[PDB]
Enzyme design. Structure first.
Site, PDB file in Angstrom:
ATOM      1  N   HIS A  30      -1.409  -6.475  -6.422  1.00 59.65           N
ATOM      2  CA  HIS A  30       0.025  -6.858  -6.290  1.00 59.65           C
ATOM      3  C   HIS A  30       0.718  -6.208  -5.068  1.00 59.65           C
ATOM      4  CE1 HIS A  30       1.380  -3.280  -8.871  1.00 59.65           C
ATOM      5  NE2 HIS A  30       2.400  -3.340  -7.977  1.00 59.65           N
ATOM      6  N   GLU A  54      -6.251  -6.650 -10.939  1.00 56.32           N
ATOM      7  CA  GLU A  54      -5.373  -5.764 -10.120  1.00 56.32           C
ATOM      8  C   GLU A  54      -6.208  -4.881  -9.191  1.00 56.32           C
ATOM      9  OE1 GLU A  54      -1.019  -4.687 -10.583  1.00 56.32           O
ATOM     10  OE2 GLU A  54      -2.230  -6.089  -9.227  1.00 56.32           O
ATOM     11  N   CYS A 139       1.837   2.447  -6.214  1.00 57.36           N
ATOM     12  CA  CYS A 139       0.733   1.524  -6.553  1.00 57.36           C
ATOM     13  C   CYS A 139      -0.236   1.423  -5.371  1.00 57.36           C
ATOM     14  CB  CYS A 139       1.206   0.175  -7.051  1.00 57.36           C
ATOM     15  SG  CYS A 139       1.964   0.218  -8.712  1.00 57.36           S
TER      16      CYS A 139
END
Lengths: 172, 162, 172, 162
Positions: A30, A54, A139
Site C-alpha cells: 500500500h 501487503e 509502513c
C-alpha cells in the site's frame, strides 16, 4: 541495530522500503504509488515484481545498490522471537522498536483486512502514538533479528491496532 | 475462592460465573448426553458462539456463589491470569499479556478469539481447555473468556470470548 | 513441581518448613515457636541449629525422614531465574507460584526490616490476596527451580509487599 | 516530543520536566564546574537526595516546553519506559515492570531506589545513567525517576526517586 542495516532503510512512496541485496528491494504494497511506471531510474519492463498481499518484492536487472552485500530474507520467524522494527523519524533519529512475535493472523484494523505475522510491542503500556509506538508513516519498515552471527530480515510493517500494542509484519 | 468456581467438565474444565451461569470451551463439551450437573437439557439454555459456550440453568446449581462480572474480552495490554487446575491437585495461575481479537493459525487450525502471550510447570497443556481468563479491576474480579488453543511452544494462547 | 518435592513441604509452627535430606530441615526463623525445646521428638541438645537472620537450618543426629534422598541447597539463584514457591493451601490444593528472581535486597515491609533475595510474581497484576498471591501463613515455603536434570532449593519465603507483587526469599 | 526533553549531561543524561526544572542521576554530574546550561551556579537551586538530583533555574532555559507531572516512583506492577538515547542517534524506549523501593546490591555496590525488571539492542549500558522512567496514566505522561544502576545481566535495574 548495526549501521549497515540502517543504510538499507530507504524513504519510498508514502513510507519505507529495504534493500536485501544490490538487486532486491522489499516494501509494503500500500505505500507504492499506483500510477508509478519508474523505480530508481529503471522502467517496469526491466523489473520483476512479486506481490503477495501487503508484501511486495522488486528484483532489478541492474545492481542499484552495489555498496551492499546480500543478506538472508525469511518468511516470518519463530513464535517468541524478539525483532527490531527499523523506524526512521523526523531528524536523523533512529527508533529500533522491540516487538515479541506471535502467530500468523487475519485481523480487521480500522478500514482494512490485514494478514501477516502478529507481534506485541515491548516499548511500554505506553505505545499509543509516536514516542513509543508506530505511526501510519512507518509502513514498509523492516522487521530484523540476530541469529548466532547472522542478521535476518523477516518482513515489513503493514498495520497497528488503535491501542498501538499489536502490530502486523507482512511476510513473503 | 475463585478456584472453587473452576470445575472439571467433559475433556477439560469450565467456570461458574453465578449460581445459574457456567461457561466453557465448545470443543470440550460431550457430544453424547441427556443431562449436565443433574439437570435435563430441556431445563438448560445453551448459547454457542464459535469456541465460547454459556449454559444458563433454570435452578441454582451453585447457590454458595455470588454473581461476578463477565465481559467480551478485555483491553489490549491487560495482564490476565488463566486459572488452570490439574488432576494432581495443582493450581497454576498463569500470567498472560492480552493482545488483539484475530483469526489465528494455531498448530494448522484457525481459531477466532483474543490473542495473548505468557510472561513466563510454567505453561498450558491440552487437558487445560476451558480454564477461565480473569483479572482484578479496582476492587472487582472480571472473567473475560475461556482457554481455547495454544501453540507447540507456549508463548501464544487464544481466549475464546462471548 | 514433582510429587517428591511436595512430600518434603511440612506444616511447622506458624507456617512451613522443608526437608533437604533425611537429617536437614530448613524454615523461616519467625515461624519457629520461641519456647520450643523439642522438634520431631528430639531434644535441642541432639540438634545443630544454624540461624542467619530469617533463614534457619536444623541438622538432626538421627535420620528423621529416611524415605528421602539428599538434594542440592544453594545460597539464592542467578538474577532472572524463574522459581516456584511450593505453597500448600486449605484442602490438599498445591499452588506452585511462579516468581522471577532479582537482586539481594534490604527492605522495610509492614512492621519488619527484611533481608534476602527479592523476586516479582508472574501470577497476574492480580497478586493482592490468597487466590494468585502469598499470605502470611505461607512463610517458610521453599523456592525451587530445575537446572538441567537436577532440582535445586535456594531459600524460604520470608515476606511480601502490600500489593503482593514483590516477595523476599531468606537465603543461607 | 518526550525525546526532545532527554539531554546529554556530564557522563550520562538528564530530563527537562519544565522550562526551569532538570532532573538527573547524582553520580553523572560534573564535580568541577562554575555554570550549567550557561547559568552561574548562584542562579540555580540544586536538590540532592541520594542518586536523585533536581536543578531549578531562575530563568526559562527550555521555554519551548510545558511542565509535566513528576512523582516519587510509581505503583508496583506499573510498566515504565526508560527513554535511552545513544550518540549514534538511536532512541531505545525499554519496557520495565516496576517493583518495590529497596536497598540493593548491584555489582558489589548498595543503591537505594525503585527496583524494576526488563520485559525483553534490548538492554541498558553504563553511559545510559540519568535516562528518565516515564508512563502514560489516562491522558497524562508521568516521570517518576532517573536510571541509576543495572546488574551485569540486565534483568534488574534501579530508578532513583525524589
Amino acid at each position: 541495530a548495526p549501521p549497515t542495516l540502517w543504510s538499507r532503510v530507504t524513504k519510498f512512496g508514502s513510507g519505507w522500503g529495504f534493500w536485501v541485496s544490490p538487486t532486491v528491494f522489499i516494501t509494503t504494497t500500500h505505500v507504492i504509488p499506483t500510477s508509478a511506471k519508474e523505480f530508481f531510474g529503471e522502467p517496469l519492463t526491466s523489473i520483476a515484481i512479486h506481490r503477495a498481499g501487503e508484501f511486495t518484492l522488486f528484483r532489478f536487472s541492474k545492481k542499484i545498490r552495489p555498496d551492499l552485500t546480500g543478506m538472508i530474507l525469511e518468511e516470518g520467524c519463530p513464535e517468541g522471537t524478539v525483532c527490531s522494527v527499523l523506524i526512521k523519524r523526523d531528524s536523523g533519529e533512529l527508533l529500533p522498536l522491540a516487538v515479541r512475535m506471535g502467530a500468523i493472523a487475519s485481523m480487521r484494523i480500522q478500514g482494512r483486512l490485514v494478514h501477516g505475522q502478529s507481534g506485541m510491542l515491548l516499548t511500554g503500556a505506553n505505545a499509543k502514538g509516536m514516542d513509543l509506538g508506530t505511526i501510519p508513516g512507518d509502513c514498509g519498515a523492516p522487521y530484523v533479528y540476530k541469529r548466532a552471527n547472522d542478521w535476518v530480515v523477516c518482513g515489513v510493517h503493514a498495520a497497528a491496532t488503535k491501542s498501538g500494542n499489536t502490530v502486523v509484519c507482512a511476510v513473503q
